[PDB]
Design an enzyme around this catalytic site. Structure first.
Site, PDB file in Angstrom:
ATOM      1  N   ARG C 155      59.394  26.176  14.348  1.00 56.56           N
ATOM      2  CA  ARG C 155      59.377  25.648  12.991  1.00 56.56           C
ATOM      3  C   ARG C 155      59.427  26.797  11.969  1.00 56.56           C
ATOM      4  O   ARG C 155      59.044  27.943  12.259  1.00 56.56           O
ATOM      5  CB  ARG C 155      58.158  24.750  12.757  1.00 56.56           C
ATOM      6  N   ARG C 274      65.278  21.090  15.506  1.00 57.88           N
ATOM      7  CA  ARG C 274      64.220  20.639  16.439  1.00 57.88           C
ATOM      8  C   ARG C 274      64.603  19.245  16.916  1.00 57.88           C
ATOM      9  O   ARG C 274      64.623  18.932  18.103  1.00 57.88           O
ATOM     10  CB  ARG C 274      62.880  20.528  15.697  1.00 57.88           C
ATOM     11  N   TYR C 306      62.655  11.262  18.296  1.00 60.84           N
ATOM     12  CA  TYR C 306      63.904  11.971  18.085  1.00 60.84           C
ATOM     13  C   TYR C 306      65.102  11.379  18.871  1.00 60.84           C
ATOM     14  O   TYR C 306      66.239  11.767  18.628  1.00 60.84           O
ATOM     15  CB  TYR C 306      63.723  13.496  18.242  1.00 60.84           C
TER      16      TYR C 306
END
Lengths: 319, 323, 319, 323
Positions: C155, C274, C306
């Site tokens: 991140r 990500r 996701y």
DNA sequence: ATAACTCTATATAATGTATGCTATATAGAGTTAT
DNA sequence: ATAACTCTATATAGCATACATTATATAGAGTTAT
DNA sequence: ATAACTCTATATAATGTATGCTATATAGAGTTAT
DNA sequence: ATAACTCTATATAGCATACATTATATAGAGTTAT
């Protein structure tokens, strides 16, 4: 007070059934033991005094019992108290520490908890190779049991609880055994242990020669008398102690009568095929995730234990 | 009370065999340090006050001590108070807070856990080379050692504690050794490790040269004096101090004096042989469980920490980016 | 009392550092908001009254904010109180229920938490296909960032914390990036994110053209001025807000300038790679266990999210 | 207090939109039953006394009620008291005990969770056959249905709630449908399910025959009266009562009147289509996640319960015993 | 007589680790329009 | 004198026993249909 | 002038979920026998 | 009258939001070396 305590105890006894009859059996066995010790030394057995419980544990140790035995005595006493609304003996450093010390001293002298002699596909294959041919009822049964024990990994009590109405079919004709309560789970969902085609046959032969299917509410396994006549029942299971002699008997059959040592695990026993199958699975390269479902475990340690003592190195320093 | 507490410290002492020698040493060590600081800074050391322990943990961090070491300190203090019936300093918001802070502050300063410098096969060969052709008793002994440690990924103690009533002779010009790398009741009683033409042999010489096998109750490893004479003992083992010695000593021979500032793991340590053992075993990719074989591991972050920098363990993303 | 409360608060502020500077930022942002609302209605902002907090939450709802926004206001207020040694507003049915109700009503009207526009291998390949050729410093950097972002899944803040001395080699010559603290873990062990040969190159070019390696205690990423001269620093990182513009810029580069809608996720952002990598992994058939390590998750839900919206059925009813 | 409690029930009512219509119905239902029993057996229903709730749960089990139903009962009671500020009956040793006992006692009597009777392809074909060649409006409508439910493993509500501003026409003589099988904020907004020559077509007829597409704000499924005339509605949907109807109704046509005693799942229910959908999808082994596609599942014991009796899911032991 | 258990008590190994809000199933009662 | 240790103490890395129960292990005593 | 940031504040997504007993590393101080 | 529902109520199967924080998203205002 003493009122509150007689009420918590008495509330316990009322819903006695929330715990295993074995928990009760062991609760009362530990209490006999304790009360016994207390009477000899003129001690109050309840509530128990940390210092008194500490002398008891050492006394068990001195009696040469296993760390697990001693811990059981401590756990029952702790249960008695906790469930009473009182302090747990383990809540006192005298008891907490003596337990660690006893364990530590016993293992720092050897002691390791045992595990039943394994029963793997090879042992199954040979036993089956040998009994297959028997037209006796006891054998047809015993072979089906050993078959289900190894195939499903179920524990004695799970197997002894299988009633006829819990068996089904896959389509391919494999028998499905639905499991209700286990040592690790009491739910209505439950499980369905499926049998291989070979084991199905084995089980199908037993059902036939025995006439258990006569009442679907009958337990799959029952006695078979000297005269070879089975004895179906929808009310009484074959005793756990019998389901286990089957293992010892079978072993006596192949390897003969056991030592005079008086040790434990000289022959196969109720857990023999669980240990053995778990293993066989590892070798085959079965996935831990999968090895675990087979045994119904929700964790990884027992499973781990059942596998232990290759040579990747020697094979690495000979280039 | 002072009486509840006195009864409590008496319990501790009565059942002192409820902890390892080592644990006691660490407890004693921590109290000695906490006590000295409490004197110095005019405070009471028992019972411990939260603000004070908070002052001490900051003192320790300022001492440039590791997060894991500041833990042991609170840890032992927490145990002392627990086993005496007093409150745990960790059960205080001030201590719970500062410990939290310190850990974040330190990791953000580059706190680097350390692990052993791999003593892998390249190293075993190279050293094997230098000392291969030497007549020196202690040189022959130290070879075997680095052999039993790399070939076996055995712990120090288990090679020290080793006897020669524990050493068989299996599969044809090869030895085998019965041991015990457990202490868990619900675990193993022992095992049997084997040896190649590499080790096994080397160990032979140490058998000829060291005269070891005379009272086979005899520990395989003994001390070798300045005269190069060896002293057996079915009663004493080589301190774990000495075996870590052979590792550093042997790293110096190849790489020289110490090196960079007083670090920790600048040379080979008692663990180096297992570290490199696994990497080599992983480099030819053997299988984790077979890897945990040579070892005795039941965790992983311990094997995987040892496995990480290799190309084999790069991860799925690299594997995807590269086709 | 009020003494105890000023002490718990003040003990908090002392070890301010036990929490993220963002926790503080958000604690104080929520308090401003609350205190603001309280002043208008002549209400005591602390301790907060359940009924008052309840009006506040509805007021946020009415201001048209997201369920997650509202929950954040509630969580900070709850933190303030709990950490004070006082009752948590959520401890009152007025507040507990209004929150459920607000969520329930907002989702029973649509609302779903968003997730950044994905950035997958295809987007990486095209962007790289295009910037590869640039001799500009900003681009060399930006391409290396996008490379590391997609490769490692780190991140923004993790990436911005990479100092030169955290990079190593596998043997095969792949760069290893060691990670200290993450949103999910603050330990000394930590991780080592490894880069592909291709990405390594990318990173190696940036290091070269920039001269960050000049001080191993320098942050891997730094500013690069209009004149193309980098600006290494061992004291100041490239701002989180910058590491994110890189994502928006890159997207502007390929798809042009974004909507006027004012929505969120019109272009790639800090979480873009990500989401995108997690996915790419699923498709490739990567094992969840593995997809999870890649992202450093210790659980399965984000990962699950996701991935979402094949046709096994239509393909099943056309025999 | 009676005032703490009064304020508490007022909070409940004020923010009643904090629970589903359904939850409220169940709460109301449980209290009505607990209340009636408390009258009958001369006890107080609010606040609930542990011994009394214990008496009631045994009454429920003796009522031959399922463990899962006795739970809902304690569950709602526990909620009522929690949301009113009183103690939870579950927080009592008597209630904690008896519930424990009852569950063991019941499972040991053959408590069998139930699930839907699979409406698999064999069933879809067979029925497809019987009603394939029929002119009857309601017969054509019911075909589509069993098509959208099997082909799509969609939930009842999501087929009822369906409009025809939600129905596209993709890949060449095939339809596609936009939906929404979520309600989780941190979830999905909706999706798009497709249709084969099987479904899609069938749905066409229902388009011709039902006259549906006239006010395309029109729900695809409507009611078909005794005259066989169909009534569109962009304002009303077919109760979930009716759609479960088409399932049982259709099971009767093939298998006849009801059957064995008042069981639960003796015929096909709203869930049968998904059940059989997965098994068929599993029988040709498709992949769990692709399976959870047609569905929307995020758990498994729900898919795997549906998967269990198949030969494909027999487990590793069978696989080993058979070579 | 006895095989094949049952029982029972002490001894010791083995294992998870927890709900509560919301949907459906279902049989009946109530409602429209045919 | 020193090589070659062993002991120590403080520093840090690497593990693994404490809950609460539920189950099996085993010898021996009692039971029943043959 | 300005590109390329920094900062900062409000808005909103994303995630784990925890220790404590025991070993080793290591540098020094202490001990034997050479 | 009934087919064809819809409403209901009680029965049970199938899910999924409440903690405590830590992080990113984004527009806009301020900063600095060119």
């Amino acid at each position: 007070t003493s009122d509150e305590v007689r009420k918590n105890l008495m509330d316990m006894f009322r819903d006695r059934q929330a715990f295993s009859e074995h928990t009760w059996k062991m609760l009362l066995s530990v209490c006999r033991s304790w009360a016994a010790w207390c009477k000899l030394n003129n001690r109050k057995w309840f509530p128990a005094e940390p210092e008194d419980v500490r002398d008891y544990l050492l006394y068990l140790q001195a009696r040469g019992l296993a760390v697990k035995t001693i811990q059981q005595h401590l756990g029952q006493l702790n249960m008695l108290h906790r469930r009473s609304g009182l302090p747990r003996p383990s809540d006192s450093n005298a008891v907490s520490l003596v337990m660690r010390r006893i364990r530590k001293e016993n293992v720092d002298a050897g002691e390791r908890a045992k595990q039943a002699l394994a029963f793997e596909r090879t042992d199954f294959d040979q036993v089956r190779s040998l009994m297959e041919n028997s037209d006796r009822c006891q054998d047809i049964r015993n072979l089906a049991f050993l078959g289900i024990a190894y195939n499903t990994l179920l524990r004695l009590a799970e197997i002894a609880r299988i009633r006829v109405k819990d068996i089904s079919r896959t389509d391919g004709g494999r028998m499905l055994i639905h499991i209700g309560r286990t040592k690790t789970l009491v739910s209505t969902a439950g499980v369905e242990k499926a049998l291989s085609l070979g084991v199905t046959k084995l089980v199908e032969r037993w059902i036939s020669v025995s006439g258990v299917a006569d009442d679907p509410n009958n337990y799959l396994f029952c006695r078979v008398r000297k005269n070879g006549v089975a004895a179906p029942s929808a009310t009484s299971q074959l005793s756990n102690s019998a389901l286990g002699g089957i293992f010892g008997a079978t072993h006596r059959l192949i390897y003969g009568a056991k030592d005079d040592s008086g040790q434990r695990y000289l022959a196969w026993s109720g857990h023999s095929a669980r240990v053995g199958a778990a293993r066989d699975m590892a070798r085959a390269g079965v996935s831990i995730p999968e090895i675990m479902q087979a045994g119904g475990w929700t964790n990884v340690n027992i499973v781990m234990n059942y596998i232990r003592n290759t040579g990747a190195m020697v094979r690495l320093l000979e280039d």
